[PDB]
Design a protein around this motif. Structure first.
Motif, PDB file in Angstrom:
ATOM      1  N   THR A 399       0.827  -1.200   0.000  1.00 28.94           N
ATOM      2  CA  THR A 399       0.000   0.000   0.000  1.00 28.94           C
ATOM      3  C   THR A 399       0.865   1.256   0.000  1.00 28.94           C
ATOM      4  OG1 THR A 399      -1.676  -1.263   1.189  1.00 28.94           O
ATOM      5  CG2 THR A 399      -1.930   1.109   1.187  1.00 28.94           C
ATOM      6  N   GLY A 400       2.049   1.180   0.607  1.00 31.33           N
ATOM      7  CA  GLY A 400       2.973   2.300   0.624  1.00 31.33           C
ATOM      8  C   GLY A 400       3.599   2.632  -0.716  1.00 31.33           C
TER       9      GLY A 400
ATOM     10  N   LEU B   3      -4.078  -3.531  13.006  1.00 27.73           N
ATOM     11  CA  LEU B   3      -4.233  -2.946  11.680  1.00 27.73           C
ATOM     12  C   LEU B   3      -4.020  -1.443  11.789  1.00 27.73           C
ATOM     13  CD1 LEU B   3      -6.081  -5.735  11.481  1.00 27.73           C
ATOM     14  CD2 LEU B   3      -7.076  -4.550   9.507  1.00 27.73           C
ATOM     15  N   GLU B   6      -2.828   3.065   8.308  1.00 30.31           N
ATOM     16  CA  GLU B   6      -2.956   3.109   6.847  1.00 30.31           C
ATOM     17  C   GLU B   6      -1.934   4.081   6.240  1.00 30.31           C
ATOM     18  OE1 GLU B   6      -4.861   0.972   5.205  1.00 30.31           O
ATOM     19  OE2 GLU B   6      -4.504   1.755   3.189  1.00 30.31           O
ATOM     20  N   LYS B   7      -0.670   3.670   6.342  1.00 28.25           N
ATOM     21  CA  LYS B   7       0.418   4.413   5.722  1.00 28.25           C
ATOM     22  C   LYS B   7       0.259   4.353   4.209  1.00 28.25           C
ATOM     23  CE  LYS B   7       3.683   3.595   9.494  1.00 28.25           C
ATOM     24  NZ  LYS B   7       3.825   5.016   9.913  1.00 28.25           N
ATOM     25  N   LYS B   8      -0.231   5.440   3.628  1.00 25.88           N
ATOM     26  CA  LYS B   8      -0.655   5.470   2.237  1.00 25.88           C
ATOM     27  C   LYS B   8       0.238   6.388   1.417  1.00 25.88           C
ATOM     28  CE  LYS B   8      -2.917   9.720   2.538  1.00 25.88           C
ATOM     29  NZ  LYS B   8      -2.869  10.876   1.604  1.00 25.88           N
ATOM     30  N   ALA B   9       0.360   6.077   0.135  1.00 28.95           N
ATOM     31  CA  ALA B   9       1.132   6.883  -0.794  1.00 28.95           C
ATOM     32  C   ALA B   9       0.178   7.684  -1.664  1.00 28.95           C
ATOM     33  CB  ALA B   9       2.031   6.008  -1.662  1.00 28.95           C
ATOM     34  N   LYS B  11      -0.725   9.472  -5.057  1.00 32.23           N
ATOM     35  CA  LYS B  11      -0.396   9.224  -6.460  1.00 32.23           C
ATOM     36  C   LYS B  11      -0.425  10.570  -7.180  1.00 32.23           C
ATOM     37  CE  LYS B  11      -2.023   5.640  -8.642  1.00 32.23           C
ATOM     38  NZ  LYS B  11      -2.985   4.656  -9.211  1.00 32.23           N
ATOM     39  N   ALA B  28       5.668   7.861  -5.014  1.00 30.93           N
ATOM     40  CA  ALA B  28       5.068   7.346  -3.785  1.00 30.93           C
ATOM     41  C   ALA B  28       5.308   8.352  -2.663  1.00 30.93           C
ATOM     42  CB  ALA B  28       5.642   5.977  -3.445  1.00 30.93           C
ATOM     43  N   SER B  30       4.676   9.880   0.603  1.00 26.35           N
ATOM     44  CA  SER B  30       4.081   9.413   1.846  1.00 26.35           C
ATOM     45  C   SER B  30       4.812  10.042   3.023  1.00 26.35           C
ATOM     46  CB  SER B  30       4.126   7.885   1.945  1.00 26.35           C
ATOM     47  OG  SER B  30       5.460   7.431   2.083  1.00 26.35           O
ATOM     48  N   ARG B  33       8.228   8.094   3.777  1.00 20.93           N
ATOM     49  CA  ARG B  33       9.386   8.230   2.907  1.00 20.93           C
ATOM     50  C   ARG B  33      10.034   9.601   2.968  1.00 20.93           C
ATOM     51  NH1 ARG B  33       9.924   3.959  -0.501  1.00 20.93           N
ATOM     52  NH2 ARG B  33       8.176   2.490  -0.323  1.00 20.93           N
ATOM     53  N   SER B  47      15.477  12.604 -10.843  1.00 15.47           N
ATOM     54  CA  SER B  47      14.494  11.929 -11.676  1.00 15.47           C
ATOM     55  C   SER B  47      13.693  12.885 -12.551  1.00 15.47           C
ATOM     56  CB  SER B  47      13.558  11.093 -10.807  1.00 15.47           C
ATOM     57  OG  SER B  47      12.534  10.507 -11.590  1.00 15.47           O
TER      58      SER B  47
END
Ligand SMILES: Nc1nc2c(ncn2[C@@H]2O[C@H](COP(=O)(O)OP(=O)(O)O)[C@@H](O)[C@H]2O)c(=O)[nH]1
Ligand SMILES: Nc1nc2c(ncn2[C@@H]2O[C@H](COP(=O)(O)OP(=O)(O)O)[C@@H](O)[C@H]2O)c(=O)[nH]1
Lengths: 429, 99, 429
Positions: A399-400, B3, B6-9, B11, B28, B30, B33, B47
């Motif tokens: 998910t990361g 649970l 919710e470490k989410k990236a 987009k 990504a 987040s 990172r 990049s």
């Protein structure tokens, strides 16, 4: 004409290919330098299918080698037949897969696929009339499953009519090389059922049994396991590289083996396989090659074919042999084993006979068989997927990387839409 | 509870300034990172500029319109492209056309 | 007949020329003493174009070397092939440029140009039928930009019909060798658009990429960068020095490449360029030379040709080759890439085929291409000019040499009258 572009991917896809180009070079008579040392002129007639003639009578392979770390490409160029590949084809990144599908298909796959396709497009515009591609990867790791399925989705947008066959290595049922190998296999079969034309499922566990029960090897290293896969890969296109009596290719097998466009997962098989001291207590005839293919201890996927039904069966024979002797043995194993074949397809055995044997033997065969006994192979991936996904463990590494749970739900629902087809056509009438 | 949070990236897409022939690589982004907004500019260095763009590097990220200089990463959002510039002067071309 | 007078200027114009006369002497077979050691009589047939026969079977170059300090002329006469030049041609002053256009074109340029033109006039009255001049300078420094454009304005008043082509070195976009290089380039393009006939724009940054990506050189010094420019300079006039099948010269390229008298800035390109260990994994055929010219990683100006449109394209081939094979590859890259060429010019590819290859290879090409992708090159000079001029910084080193602001305003307005033409003819119909 009818050229084949070879694509490799990952650690496993290189070490199959680095053994594969050692077998092709021995059939055509190519030194590790790249020159020619043959004896007959039949080896140079169809040399253009796997080789481009360089300047100075040197032949270089039409291979494209992909990895995310340079650790495996360093061993390929330094080994035997490693000086034959062109140095531009070694396309490799610096990050590394991390044994992860999301790092192979989304994050580090996108930074590399624009540089790989500059090599695929250059090799495809140099061939006269392209036959079709081929790919060697593995469904367990990260590069062969993430970068490997990303290349197929980009090629199929550019070449919508050329064939595309993958020599995958499906993970074994008992042991597990990777903890997250159910995730890397479920998220890869969802890509292969919509973007390939035929797929060869190979299990590692069925190859350890052949080296232990049939060949009687004491210490089988991967030089001895990958030598059997490379004999099967050359045995499919062997009617394309040599003249024969009843010729086949990668297109005639894609028609005669695939009745529905979702049912294209095969299981391979090679014959004859003799031991080291038992190759004198045996006659090499056609009824010896026949009864060594169809039994369960010579398959390369860890599934007994007795649990299901054969839809289509291909048998590619090599060497000089009588056609009456082949057309009777294929009929005889179809009449007495009339339950293990399917009813709504009459005469479901495809025959192809070449003329030139492999180097060392007198005659040889190759078994390319479709079955509904590979529904046991997709139950075990789907059971191990739902055992790990219902606790949502090993999920924050996915998910990361920019991924949601709907990517997993449509992946597992596609696989249960595949299991409900092999169970459906097994019980037809 | 196990649970976790919710470490989410996100987009998000990053066009580069002036270059009309570029698509923007989805990153990504987040909280795992990049601890600071200044650490996000370091990944934008390698990049985006390869041979021909951005002599001053990566300094000032503008909006896709763009009229707001982006502050911290909490000023970002999910699913919107961005234009990466390196000067106070902003070039107004059509970035998001033909994604 | 058809002689060429070679003019050099500045530090950079010498070190290109000191490598240029090392390549010409190896094609015609000239020792560093000045004698002849050839093998075939084709090398002495057209020797008069770059050489005057001295007394005693020695050949001296028709070169005129200009500088404002003796620091660079001291290294030219002491290096290899430095004893071949005549000692009268070393025209040099004692003051020095100071890396300044006003000291190169107004103050110290006027004290020297009356002594240089005594050598230009002496060499031009000694040739039988003059073809045209050529100049090697750089737009960044002071001597190659101030003294270099002063010589063109004095020659064009005396020879209004002879051609005049300059091999300039346009400054790179990323790094900057000179702080005031936007001023030395804006005040030089204003002189070149009214006094030349064709101009070869070369960037340093595009030459570092070829030595790093294509030739794979570890430590490329300027002996390795200027060797590529000198191969392109000889590759334009190579149909004038040797017999061919379809001959060209410096006049036929000045007609077929220049449709409007202000659009004459080119971009060069050489082929083939192989690596040190990858020159055996390659076939030297005409479809290999074709697909190595037209891609963006082989140009010598730092601009992608995909951003614009080709107006005219010249391809000067060398070596024995089939004319059908050349006339089909030029057509094939024009039909499939039909968007990147221009519409209102049909069949915009000029072909020239010589017979004698360069020393070492079997066949070779040279790409002389016009494009509207060099409007990116003049936006970056004009943006960096207006960024420095609106604060009027670095201006008292120019105004103190007898110069006003109207000299700058008519210079930058001329450049924006040039950018509004490449944008105009890119979108015609
Ligand atoms: N048959 C065979 N399988 C191999 C070999 N090396 C690795 N594998 C398989 O490759 C998988 C591990 O993934 P890996 O090769 O590292 O791929 P990657 O992680 O995507 O680079 C397992 O299923 C191994 O059984 C080999 O030499 N032969
Ligand atoms: N390609 C190339 N460029 C050079 C060389 N030496 C200097 N230059 C270029 O020359 C410019 C500097 O100006 P300079 O040569 O000193 O000319 P001057 O100041 O007018 O005498 C820069 O653009 C350098 O890149 C060389 O050997 N090769």
């Amino acid at each position: 004409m009818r050229e084949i572009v070879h694509i490799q991917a990952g650690q496993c896809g290189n070490q199959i290919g680095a053994k594969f180009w050692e077998v092709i070079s021995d059939e055509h008579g190519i030194d590790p330098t790249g020159s020619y040392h043959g004896d007959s002129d039949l080896q140079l007639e169809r040399i253009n299918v796997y080789y481009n003639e360089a300047a100075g009578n040197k032949y270089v392979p039409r291979a494209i080698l992909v990895d995310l770390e340079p650790g495996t490409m360093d061993s390929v160029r330094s080994g035997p037949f490693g000086q034959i590949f062109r140095p531009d084809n070694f396309v490799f990144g610096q990050s590394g897969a991390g044994n992860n599908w999301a790092k192979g298909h989304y994050t580090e796959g996108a930074e590399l696929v624009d540089s790989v396709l500059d090599v695929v497009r250059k090799e495809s515009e140099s061939c006269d009339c392209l036959q079709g591609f081929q790919l060697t990867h593995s469904l367990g790791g990260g590069t062969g499953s993430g970068m490997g399925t990303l290349l197929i989705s980009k090629i199929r947008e550019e070449y919508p009519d050329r064939i595309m066959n993958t020599f995958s290595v499906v993970p074994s049922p008992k042991v597990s090389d990777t903890v997250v190998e159910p995730y890397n296999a479920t998220l890869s079969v969802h890509q292969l059922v919509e973007n390939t034309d035929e797929t060869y499922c190979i299990d590692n566990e069925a190859l350890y049994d052949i080296c232990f029960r049939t060949l009687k090897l004491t210490t089988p290293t991967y030089g001895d396991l990958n030598h059997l896969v490379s004999a099967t890969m050359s045995g499919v296109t062997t009617c394309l590289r040599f003249p024969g009596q009843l010729n086949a290719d990668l297109r005639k097998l894609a028609v005669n083996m695939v009745p529905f466009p979702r049912l294209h997962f095969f299981m391979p098989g090679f014959a004859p396989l003799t031991s080291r001291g038992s190759q004198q207590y045996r006659a090499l005839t056609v009824p010896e090659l026949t009864q060594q293919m169809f039994d369960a201890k010579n398959m390369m996927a860890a599934c007994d074919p007795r649990h299901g039904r054969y839809l289509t069966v291909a048998a590619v024979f090599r060497g000089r042999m009588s056609m009456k002797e082949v057309d009777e043995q294929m009929l005889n194993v179809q009449n007495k084993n009339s339950s293990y074949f399917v009813e709504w397809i009459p005469n479901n055995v495809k025959t192809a006979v070449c003329d030139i044997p492999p180097r060392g033997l007198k005659m040889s065969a190759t078994f390319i068989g479709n079955s509904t006994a590979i529904q046991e192979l997709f139950k075990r991936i789907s059971e191990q997927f739902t055992a790990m996904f219902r606790r949502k463990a090993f999920l924050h590494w996915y998910t990361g990387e920019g991924m949601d749970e709907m990517e997993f739900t449509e992946a597992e629902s596609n696989m249960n839409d595949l299991v409900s087809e092999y169970q459906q056509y097994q019980d037809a009438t | 509870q196990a649970l976790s949070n919710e470490k989410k990236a996100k987009k998000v897409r990053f066009y580069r300034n002036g270059d009309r022939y570029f698509k923007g690589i989805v990153y990504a982004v987040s909280s795992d990172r990049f601890r600071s907004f200044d650490a996000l500019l370091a990944d934008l260095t390698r990049s985006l500029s390869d041979n021909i763009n951005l002599p001053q590097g990566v300094r000032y990220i503008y909006t896709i319109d763009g009229s707001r200089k982006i502050g911290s990463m909490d000023e970002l959002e999910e699913g919107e492209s961005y234009v990466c510039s390196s000067d106070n002067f902003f070039k107004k071309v059509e970035y998001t056309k033909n994604v």
